[PDB]
Amino acid sequence: SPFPLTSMDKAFITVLEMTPVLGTEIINYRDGMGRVLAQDVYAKDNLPPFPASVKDGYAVRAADGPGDRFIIGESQAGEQPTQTVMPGQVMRVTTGAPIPCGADAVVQVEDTELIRESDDGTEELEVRILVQARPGQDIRPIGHDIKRGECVLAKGTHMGPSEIGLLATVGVTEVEVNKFPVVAVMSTGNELLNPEDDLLPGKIRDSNRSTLLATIQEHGYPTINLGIVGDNPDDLLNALNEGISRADVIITSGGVSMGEKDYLKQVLDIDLHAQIHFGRVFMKPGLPTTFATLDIDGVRKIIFALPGNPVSAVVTCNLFVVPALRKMQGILDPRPTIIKARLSCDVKLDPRPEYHRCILTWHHQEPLPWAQSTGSRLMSMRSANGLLMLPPKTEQYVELHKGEVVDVMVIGRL
């Protein structure tokens, strides 16, 4: 009773449709990187909160016009000025300083010439204003940039450094955001040893757990390492129950081929009572990829049972798991970014859509990047930042050639 071959498109939209959006929590704004706001954010103050000089120069009365002026003082950053500027007077200003009462324009220092300074040269006393200021010129009025009561960030915003800066600006230091998913990862197989182990007969080292944990951590999500679980139903069930208790998402690898001692799909259905939405996907690599949900007490747990083959495990993790995690953490459109790139060599198409890690590189002034499939010196050292997404062959199209434009999913920093 093998599972139906699910099309890639159906498998992907099934993952997104079935994956929940996690609840919310309040965080400190400094912890906001990558978080999605679950509230609108409003300014409680004006920016600037005082009329502010745009320039180093002098606060003047525009109606005085050009001419020679007594400097009555300086408006300093961080100090509300005392003095009122009267006709024939000016006050020195620096960028960002408050404009004193009496002044209605700023003349930048380049449009002036100093007439008199103190004997020790530390204080300016008289200045020539060379231009006719326009009223308001080189002043940021109160609220020019942000007004009190303005919504400055909308719920749904996926925050980066500039948004954290905006929170700092408006003094909203605690915000409601969606939670991040906690992702538990286990490996399965009697043949597996820990990375720390010397080899024993018949055995290999577990690489998927490391690769998958690192992939998830690269996207900023907390992880739980559930170790290596042997090929038997009791141990698998116990490990899955641990994952369910400790995490929002359980990723397994291995144990999902058709054939002997691959028990995971049985355990998920009969013992765990999960709903397996697909158990095979028409894709290369990744045929045995399995996706299940488990609803407990009005909470939906997500389970990805990925293929054991290490290349398949990392490919399917990027295709299916990462977008699910993005939806769980509140990203409204959780689809991965897909770009167009030129194939760096000929490739044979399969009846299945096929996927392969690659390196994306821009060449001098050429508008499209090149995609070089993994496996020169320097290029063979590059870490993969793309996943080639090649179409199924048709009776028409059987091969794609060097230079032809293909889809590439971004999986690494470009």
Ligand X SMILES: Nc1ncnc2c1ncn2[C@@H]1O[C@H](COP(=O)(O)O)[C@@H](O)[C@H]1O
**Which of positions 225-254 make contact with ligand X (CB under 6 A)?**
253-254
Shortest Å, Cβ 96 to ligand X: 2
Task: Figure out which of the listed residues 24, 46, 83, 257 binds ligand X, where binding follows CB under 6 A.
Answer: 257
- Position 309 contacts ligand X (CB under 6 A): yes
Reading the block at residue 79, the tokens are 């100090």
Q: Least CB distance from residue 94 to ligand X, whole Å? A: 6
SS (H, E, C) 21-72: CCCEEEEEHHHCCCCEECCCEECCCCECCCCEECCCEEEECHHHCCEEEEEE
* Residue 187 partner contact from a second copy, ligand X, Mg ion, none using kind-dependent CB cut-offs of 5 to 8 Å: ligand X
Decide: helix, strand or coil at residue 316.
Answer: helix
Whether 90 contacts 53, CB under 8 Å? no
The least distance separating ligand X from the CB of residue 210, rounded to whole angstroms, comes to: 9
Instruction: Among 96, 143, 230, 391, indicate the residue that binds ligand X (CB under 6 A).
Output: 96
For residue 192, CA distances in Å to 109, 204, 229, 267, 285 come to 73, 5, 9, 20, 21
Nearer to a second copy, 79 or 295 (CB): 79
In the complex with ligand X, which residue's Cβ is closer, 112 or 253? 253
Residues 173 to 202 in contact with ligand X, rule: CB under 6 A? 187, 189, 191-192
The two three-digit tokens of residue 174, written as one number: 């605690």
- Asked if 249 and 325 touch (Cβ cutoff 8 Å), the reply is yes
Supply the minimum distance, in Å, between the C-beta of residue 99 and ligand X: 13
Scanning residues 171 to 190, which ones bind Mg ion (CB under 5 A)?
189
Neighbours of 136 (CB within 10 A): 13
What three-state secondary structure class fits 387?
Answer: strand
Binding flag, residue 285, ligand X (CB under 6 A): no
Residue 109 Cβ vs Mg ion, minimum distance, rounded to whole Å:
16
Which stretches of the chain bind ligand X, using CB under 6 A?
95-96, 187, 189, 191-192, 204, 206-209, 253-257, 262, 307-310
